[PDB]
Design a protein around this ligand. Structure first.
Ligand SMILES: [K+]
Ligand SMILES: [K+]
Ligand SMILES: [O]
Lengths: 325, 325, 325, 325
């Protein structure tokens, strides 16, 4: 119950000794630690330090754990005062968590997993990207009407696979731990499985995801979509409810019309999709006065359905964008 | 007029005793309550508590009712100080209102109205959703050109009605009070009235609203639209003024043209709607130099007309979204 | 130079007497006014009032005019403290301006200019709106292919003019001052000038603006557009620069093509407009590889050109919207 | 170690003399400078000045360089206190940088480079703009089907070049320094190089950029795009990844269809572009159930791809817009 006066650059703080003794590990909790700052003429402990920060420090003793940075104190200045008062590593990491902060194969694992290290590391990454870009150009040219080791496309297709196999064999016996959690390598597995044929071709387009390893923004978008599936799927659900709603509204408004462009419900789905997203079908346009109305409400409700979950998904992207800079 | 000194962890507060006696129910208003905190050596009442919060507490006595949380004090910390100073339940609920905060049938009413309680409660809700989803699929398949108890659709249509009647008979004699205010049950009434035929079919599509009971976001959007009708209808009115304006501007610009695609005013309405919402008609495009101009101004003014009331409606949605989490 | 101590509910303020005597009209500047608050035991002036507000009050004496409300003090509380310290009507109105705040014919001028006064005032406004809405419906029906005092439209056209003349003759000899500045009456003049015929018809559509007097949001949008012409016209200029830019880019990319859909520069203007506003022409689509590219860049740059000046115009609207509530 | 008490209008500040002596150039660091403010009755230095500002001033001595304006202190008031305490020109310019702040030919260089100086300076700028606007109108009329010194267009084309040469010869021997860094003159060079012919015509359209010198907003947009290329190019990259992704998804979904509108991968690129930007092709619309799905996901992912990097680019524009006012 013994009173303790703490002078912070002229700002007076008073408390009970039992409140500071609650945490015997810190500065003000250890009598031998705070001894060097005692003023025997005023019976107080003087500190020639920042003043707005000490409101939360002394409250960390009163509350017995709570360490909230004041809204007017900078983040770096308050964090450097916690080091001086020695509140503890447990309370320091809780402050960051509350603020928002989470030989034979060692050299080959430097110019491949972290291509920003050495000199040849930054060049072998460009060559690996050129193989990917040509791998994408090769996939887009295997279908032209002109074009539809001897096969003129089997010379570059395998050449990229030889490099895409060279981007996997050097990463299995040189990785830290034996790997399937990192999605960067799951893409390397789906880019190297051309051993049902159409499903493997739709699976073959996943070689575009090979750029995510070497791209700055692709990593940011990947974290955004994962950290937004609730509001990301909320759009898909809100659009599903509206498509079923408005495709049926235009169908009953254009049912007695012998030349009504909407024959059934599912045939009016794609019309409601491009009218909500405001893309524009060009084909199925309404003809009935009531059907024309339904199209107007389908375009108005479309902008609302889209623009509601977007700011949340935009905010998740702008956070990871700035945090990675 | 007797002066009273209040020491808050070193922060000095002075007032007149009549100001604290204005509220005899609280701590500082009751002399017997504040007796335990008096310091007879300094003639003051000491409190080893939070310091930035007491500005508003002592002002609650001076203003005689006003209790405004300081902008730099957290919401939980300030609210816990009101409990200590015992300002009263009337002033506490006014603070929340000012901040923004509003046997035979008892067990059957748990696995139906609150399907998150028991184990079988969370399974009977999934079965009830599967019936709804099949009920929606059934409505969309009763119109295909191929398909247009013996009727192949009368086997699932009634089967869902048997379940949709099973989702109403168990809720009338098991509800708390006899019900028409909760819109969740008005949908159950409009999903069970298939006892003018086309109007009942347009009324039949309202079975999609049955998902609002089991959906998280549908409840949020429903509250959003109700709490936004002024700005929601402001869009409909702003778009009505512009459609009448620009449909007449393109009609007089394309009147002497014998092959002008716009014959009258109402026939140019749907063109102005999809050009403001930027959907794209594909059919009626302008042909005259002046009519081409009108279409350009109709698309520019459309983005403005849409994007003005949207942020308000988005803010109403993002509030109910986060408040329900 | 005589020192003056001012005690604000325990918060100590010191200054020189010449600083308070700088404004002899206020409380602390008048010795007879502040006499009632002097404490002859401490040699200070005590005030049992708000504490965070007095930082700016005492600075109003030091700065000699500046009166800035603190960011943590509410607007109503700080404004009520200026009344107590009696800083003057000149400094009070400067604070509002700095914060953001600007018989025979007397009874007939109440149920017409302010239709919210009496009972019959709120009914005669509805009848005046029904005449306007029918006046708009009449204008839209004078052009149907079926329809294209004896003239079936001359019975309602003049009947609304009789009312639109009844909404002008009662406002010239009953107005406060003889009127042309208020744009509400300029619309009444352009709705009553049907005494070159096509220009008067395009001028006749301005009868839709008659709703601005009785509409809540139309007044808000009118103030928004006037308070945004710089950024409103900035869009028109940014779109003008892009239309000329991209219409020429697609024309040179599709010049050697004998069947290029773009014959000249001005014939590609409307394509660039609906591709920037993302409306969709449906007619003129690019055919050349380079022309296809130009269309892609014209759609990307369109969203940027639109979305830059929009938030400013949206902010001007959301300010007048909330300020009128 | 000698203690120093600083009284700021009643607010008490204490520190060690060695902390103020750390900067011997300032007021409180120079004993002769602060001598005029010493109170020999209280042993303190009194200042009749602003109170919330001195937290950062005294911390500038403790931190030994850091000068951060408090979040509640206005920018002008805090900056005027730094002048009084005389912290130094080095710390003052660091505060602005931390806040966000960077005869025979002398008279001819006033009515040309700064056309806001004299009277004839503001008129010769309008004539120079009329030549540019006619130069733009001339370029748009050299291609009409009607029109496709004797050449009817060689009379205005050279007349503008004579003026565009008059806007370069007077700026080379009258400029401050001999010029290629300022992009305003690089446009004057690309507007005066009509001395491969089609490439010079696509290079000739760059005469629209001549308006950037005399336009307020064109300068703001130019700074915006340069200060946004990372997020500006991030859109181009995000759209490139999606176009390749969805053009291949619709091609494999519409491959067995003999009348599939998408013959190859590159022929489906422009469809994915206008469906992501929601422009609307009107030509290539999907026909297969799977292809219809791909178009729906291509329109949903398009709004997301567009709306993510837009707020960053909008914020860069709104900063330069307000900073230039
Ligand atoms: K469109
Ligand atoms: K659109
Ligand atoms: O379209």
């Amino acid at each position: 119950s013994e009173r303790v006066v703490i002078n912070i650059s002229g700002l007076r703080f008073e408390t009970q000794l039992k409140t500071l003794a609650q945490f015997p590990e810190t500065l003000l909790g250890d009598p031998k630690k705070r001894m060097r700052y005692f003023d025997p003429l005023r019976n107080e402990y003087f500190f020639d330090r920042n003043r707005p920060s000490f409101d939360a420090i002394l409250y960390y003793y009163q509350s017995g754990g709570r360490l909230r940075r004041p809204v007017n104190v900078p983040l770096d200045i308050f964090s450097e005062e916690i080091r001086f008062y020695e509140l503890g590593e447990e309370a320091m990491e809780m402050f960051r968590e509350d603020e928002g902060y989470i030989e034979f194969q060692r050299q080959v694992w430097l110019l491949f997993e972290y291509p920003e290290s050495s000199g040849p590391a930054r060049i072998i990454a460009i060559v690996s990207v050129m193989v990917i870009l040509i791998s994408i150009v090769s996939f887009c040219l295997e279908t032209l009407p002109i074009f539809r080791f001897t096969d003129p496309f089997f010379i570059v297709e395998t050449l990229c696979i030889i490099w895409f196999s060279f981007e996997f064999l050097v990463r299995f016996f040189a990785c830290p731990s034996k790997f399937f959690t990192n999605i960067m390598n799951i893409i390397d597995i789906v880019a190297i499985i051309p051993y049902v044929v159409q499903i493997f071709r739709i699976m073959r387009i996943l070689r575009i995801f090979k750029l995510s390893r070497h791209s700055k923004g692709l990593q940011i978008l990947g974290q955004t979509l994962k950290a937004s599936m609730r509001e990301l799927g909320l759009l898909i659900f809100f659009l599903f409810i509206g498509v079923i709603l408005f495709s049926s509204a235009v169908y009953f408004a254009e049912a007695d019309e012998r030349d009504s462009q909407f024959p059934s419900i599912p045939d009016a789905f794609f019309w409601a999709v491009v009218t909500m997203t405001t893309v524009g079908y060009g084909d199925m346009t309404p003809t009935t006065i009531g059907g024309k109305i339904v199209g107007s409400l389908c375009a108005i409700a479309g902008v609302l359905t889209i623009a509601l979950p977007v700011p949340v998904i935009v905010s998740n992207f702008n956070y990871f964008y700035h945090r990675e800079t």
